[PDB]
């Protein structure tokens, strides 16, 4: 089974996304902010990170920056999943090492297809 680290400050969002990921046979590890994410990332290297932008303590842009500065982290694929739209958010996220940027409210089928693109 592939392992996905799901990083979002919304418990409701994490519930929905984890449910959809598990249906595909993936195993999910959760983090409610960027700091928690990096703490868990010190322990293991997931096959994929799904990453929110707007979070307390440490936001998604900061996470992306920190992933790039470590040899162990810089190759992990990241799909940014965020309520925020606009070219600037997309450009910044990609410039900091995100693979894909997707918008909330999330379309489960489109999301899962992209996850599949990167994993299988």
Give the footprint of Mg ion on this chain (CB under 5 A): 9, 52, 54
Pick between residue 84 and residue 99 the one whose CB is nearest to Mg ion. Answer: 84
Minimum Å gap between C-beta 33 and Mg ion is 9
Pick between residue 52 and residue 90 the one whose CB is nearest to Mg ion. Answer: 52
Pick between residue 45 and residue 107 the one whose CB is nearest to Mg ion. Answer: 107
What span, in angstroms and rounded, lies between the C-alpha atoms of 90 and 94? 6
Binding residues: 8-9, 52, 54
Give the strands of the sheet with 100-103, arranged side by side.
27-31, 3-7, 48-51, 78-82, 100-103
Minimum Å gap between C-beta 15 and Mg ion is 14
Nearest residue to Mg ion by CB is 54
Minimum Å gap between C-beta 22 and Mg ion is 21
Pick the closest to residue 6 from 92, 94, 34, 118 (CA basis): 34
Burial of 58 (0-12, 13-18, 19+ CB in 10 A): middle
């Amino acid at each position: 089974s592939k392992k996905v680290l799901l990083v979002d400050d919304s418990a409701v969002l994490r519930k929905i996304v984890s449910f959809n990921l598990k249906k595909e046979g993936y195993e999910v590890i959760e983090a409610e902010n960027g700091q928690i994410a990096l703490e868990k990332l010190s322990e293991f290297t997931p096959d994929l990170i799904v990453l929110d932008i707007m979070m307390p303590v440490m936001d998604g842009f900061t996470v992306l920056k920190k992933l790039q500065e470590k040899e162990e982290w810089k190759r992990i694929p990241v799909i940014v999943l965020t309520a925020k739209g606009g070219e600037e958010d997309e450009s910044l996220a990609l410039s900091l090492g995100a693979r894909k940027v997707m918008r909330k409210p999330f379309s489960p089928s489109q999301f899962i297809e992209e996850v599949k693109h990167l994993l299988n």
